[PDB]
Write a protein that binds this ligand. Structure first.
Ligand SMILES: [Mg+2]
Lengths: 130, 32, 53, 292, 111, 191, 35
RNA sequence: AUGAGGUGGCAAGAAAUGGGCUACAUUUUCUACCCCAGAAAAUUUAGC
């Protein structure tokens, strides 16, 4: 579009509720795939998006696994891994980032996200019962 | 002091709508 | 899901059915695949079966 | 067969596609490079295929499209080369030049190029006997007092080779907090994996998983295996070793430790001693493992 | 290409996470692919120049097929609508088709 | 009819062409990308009709320009980490309990994964108001769930079908464990 | 079924090997390559 | 009656060869340890 542009855009409604949000110490994202190049491109995408969203992210590569089996005709499965550990992000930032990167999850790539929520002691445990 | 910020709740399709609002119409293509 | 021993009230309280059924409900309480309704119906089936016997 | 117009259109299309890719990836089109092309095409089109050729590639057109359309005469029909009617103008021209050089000289680590490489450079097929004849002429030129120009002309025809002693990696020397120099290394034998640290100065104390070697290795064979590296280079009682081994059995662990400790000791000995240790079979991982 | 180039020169037609370690329902995905290939080859007879590509994103099932330009475009549209709707109601998921017409079969070599 | 890439300008807005994940369209991608092992005195196959380029899970819909534009519009949905929690050291101080929960992204018609019900509660015993006897009793109640090196007690709950139920069960277990460690029975006298 | 389980208390692709091979050999089974 | 029942019986013996399962030790066995202790007592067939 060079002249014909939308005049105004209806931004989605984001209401600041009154409840307190969940806090996450850590958010570890283990993506498993059959191709290393796909996982590398996904790593680039996720890391970049985290950078423009302000989230602190570190990347490492868990060791690959192979499942071999025979019918002699010998078939193979390779699983390669990429681990994206995000740190110090709230509930909403984590939620939106995860929605984005899960909707942009490529083919053959499964995801395992572990979220490490932070909580305070129950009031039943601050003092003993008398 | 740990000031826990407030939850922001958005309707089920907010993220898709924002992403779509980022993208303009394609001039050189027929409709989708 | 964890405390299903309140369905064992109509059974023998100290005989060997108490043993068998307490251990049964211990088994059921560790089942994550069933809902409460199926567990209760299963306990009721044992109720019946022992009552005919 | 590809016409020149086809290649020209491919060149124009490649330029337009390069600018399009630069626009896509956010870089400036003016400074966008071929390494950038490779990185961007790999990212946009991920591929795990092992064959690098099979992976998607965007290249300059001429790099793929080959060409061997050497025309040997013009519109009038006159051949360009005065030796054309021999059918082997390039080969016989080269032979003529060599003969002239030999006449002039008479008046006054590497290998010979293989037959197929001479074919590729001459862009003409030749038999085996004529390649022998050319190599004989080249050797004759070498025997005479060839000058600098003739030496360069010969060097056009002699390829290179390499060795397998410079590929021996000598680990760097590190320093601990106390200021003691040391060197670290790894070794492998069957399922046993060893990680050794050799100190420059010592009293011959070897600690295997924090345990003295004569206690960790009751069997004399393993102690001899640990002795072999230092005894070979005559440095018994001159170094301290701290090594950690895991997996395998007693003998696999001893062999892995021997390999790791020899690879660490390579840092404190002379290059001659490193080569001797290599030739004794000390710096080579043993690939013999259990078979299915 | 022979089978032993499936990860060297050839790729994979069907792509899904089922076979990965820990992931489940690989057999179900295999049966889905078998039925789906049979039905595509039975619904577009003599049109498919090349095998399908069955991609999966969550529920989505993208059938990226390569077809020819012999049959009239209206029949392509009619068949695309029919097959999408029937497969969506058969697999209970949002199936989609991405036909790519070619003037003729794209030969690689001769064997 | 001719492909529409001829109409695409060299300074056009790329994200508009491929807003979302879409297959490879050689009639829409304005690139002379070739893919394939060439035959003897041959070339890698052109894009038109190339099945291999269509089999790639392409990232044309996610370019750096598109990614930056998307993340610029998605900033509105984000909150801010409480600045007081500058690092871990204050993070296990103000918020001792750590609850780990897992979610799985597969591909298929069913979203159910039985492994998502597991919940892991981790709390350092030094943060619990325990005396010497209570700490001893708690540690030798839990057994292997407590690691001496780390001073961390880890309760893994997977009995209940849901995840909220398992989280509640873990909290309940910790509650009863604290109360029964702070209790001295009759047999406790004969240590 | 359930009755049978109760009285007891009181006391990879699901295809034929060849059909697997054809799909596996043609690249129709994802991630299953030949060693 | 190729259906449903009842009354009795039936539960083998001998070789020559083919195959298979067990224990078969002093460079062994039992205890402690995982290796410096104490007590016991002819044809063939494959394989590198
Ligand atoms: Mg009988």
């Amino acid at each position: 579009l060079h002249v014909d542009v939308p005049k105004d855009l209806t931004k989605p409604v984001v209401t600041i509720s009154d409840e307190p949000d969940i806090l996450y110490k850590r958010l570890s994202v283990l993506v498993k795939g059959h191709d290393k190049a796909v996982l590398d491109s996904y790593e680039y995408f996720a890391v970049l998006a985290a950078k423009e969203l302000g989230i602190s992210i570190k990347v490492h590569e868990p060791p690959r696994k192979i499942e071999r089996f025979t019918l002699r005709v010998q078939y193979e499965m390779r699983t390669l891994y990429r681990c994206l550990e995000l740190e110090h992000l709230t509930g909403s930032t984590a939620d939106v980032y995860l929605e984005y990167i899960q909707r942009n999850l490529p083919e053959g790539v499964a995801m395992e996200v572990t979220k490490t929520q932070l909580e305070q002691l129950p009031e039943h445990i601050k003092e003993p019962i008398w | 002091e740990v000031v826990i910020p407030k939850k922001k709740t958005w309707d089920k399709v907010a993220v898709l709508q924002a992403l779509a609002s980022t993208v303009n119409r394609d001039t050189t293509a027929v409709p989708y | 899901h964890i405390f299903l021993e309140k369905h064992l009230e109509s059974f023998p309280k100290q005989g060997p059915i108490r043993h068998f059924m307490e251990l049964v409900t211990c088994g059921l309480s560790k089942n994550p695949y069933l809902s409460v309704k199926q567990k209760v119906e299963h306990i009721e089936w044992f109720r019946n079966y022992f009552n005919e016997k | 067969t590809y016409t020149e117009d086809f290649i020209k259109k491919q060149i124009e299309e490649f330029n337009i596609g390069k600018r399009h890719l630069a626009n896509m990836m956010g870089e400036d089109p003016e400074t966008f490079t071929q390494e950038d092309i490779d990185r961007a095409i790999a990212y946009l089109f991920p591929s795990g295929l092992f064959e690098k050729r099979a992976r998607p590639v965007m290249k300059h057109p001429e790099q793929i499209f080959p060409r061997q359309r050497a025309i040997q005469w013009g519109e009038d029909g006159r051949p360009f080369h005065y030796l054309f009617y021999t059918g082997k103008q390039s080969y016989y021209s080269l032979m003529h030049d060599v003969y002239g050089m030999l006449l002039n000289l008479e008046k006054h680590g590497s290998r010979w190029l293989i037959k197929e490489e001479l074919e590729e450079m001459l862009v003409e097929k030749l038999s085996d006997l004529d390649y022998m004849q050319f190599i004989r002429l080249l050797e004759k030129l070498l025997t005479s007092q060839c000058g600098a120009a003739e030496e360069e002309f010969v060097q056009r025809f002699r390829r290179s080779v390499t060795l397998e002693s410079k590929k021996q990696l000598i680990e760097p020397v590190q320093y601990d907090e106390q200021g003691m120099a040391f060197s670290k290394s790894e070794g492998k034998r069957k399922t046993a994996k060893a990680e050794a640290i050799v100190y420059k100065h010592g009293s011959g104390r070897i600690k295997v998983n924090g345990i003295d070697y004569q206690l960790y290795f009751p069997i004399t064979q393993d102690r001899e295996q640990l002795m072999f590296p230092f005894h070979f280079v005559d440095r018994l009682g001159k170094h301290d070793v701290t090594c950690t081994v895991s997996g395998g059995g007693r003998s696999a662990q001893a062999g892995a430790i021997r390999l790791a400790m020899a690879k660490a000791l390579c840092s404190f000995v002379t290059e001659d001693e490193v080569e001797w240790m290599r030739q004794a079979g000390l710096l080579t991982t043993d690939p013999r493992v259990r078979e299915r | 290409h022979a089978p032993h180039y499936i990860a060297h020169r050839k790729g994979w037609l069907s792509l899904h996470t089922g076979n990965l370690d820990g992931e489940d329902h690989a057999a179900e995905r295999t049966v889905e692919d078998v039925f789906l290939r049979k039905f595509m080859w039975g619904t577009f007879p003599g049109c498919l120049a090349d095998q399908l590509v069955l991609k999966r994103r969550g529920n989505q099932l993208e059938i990226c097929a390569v077809v020819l330009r012999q049959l009239s475009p209206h029949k392509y549209y009619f068949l695309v609508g029919y097959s999408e709707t029937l497969l969506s109601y058969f697999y209970k998921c949002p199936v989609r088709l991405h036909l790519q017409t070619v003037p003729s079969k794209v030969v690689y070599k001769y064997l | 009819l001719p492909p529409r890439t001829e109409k695409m300008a060299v300074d056009q807005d790329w994200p508009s062409v491929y807003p979302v994940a879409a297959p490879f369209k050689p009639s829409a991608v304005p690139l002379p990308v070739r893919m394939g092992y060439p035959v003897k005195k041959g070339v890698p196959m052109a894009k038109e009709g190339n099945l291999e380029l269509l089999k790639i899970p392409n990232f044309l819909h996610l370019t750096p320009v598109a990614i930056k534009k998307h993340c610029e519009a998605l900033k509105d949905f984000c909150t801010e980490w409480p600045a007081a929690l500058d690092s871990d050291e204050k993070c296990e101080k103000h918020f001792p309990i750590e609850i780990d929960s897992t979610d799985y992204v597969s591909s298929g018609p069913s979203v159910r994964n039985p492994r998502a019900r597991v919940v892991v509660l981790r709390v350092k015993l030094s943060s619990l108001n325990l005396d010497d006897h209570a700490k001893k009793k708690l540690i030798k109640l839990v057994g292997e769930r407590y690691c001496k090196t780390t001073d961390v007690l880890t309760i893994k709950t997977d009995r209940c079908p849901l995840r909220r139920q398992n989280y509640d069960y873990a909290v309940y277990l910790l509650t009863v464990l604290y109360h029964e460690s702070w209790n001295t029975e009759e047999w406790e006298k004969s240590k | 079924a359930d009755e049978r389980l109760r009285i007891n208390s009181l006391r990879r692709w699901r295809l034929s090997r060849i059909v697997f091979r054809h799909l596996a050999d043609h690249g129709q089974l994802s991630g299953i390559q030949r060693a």
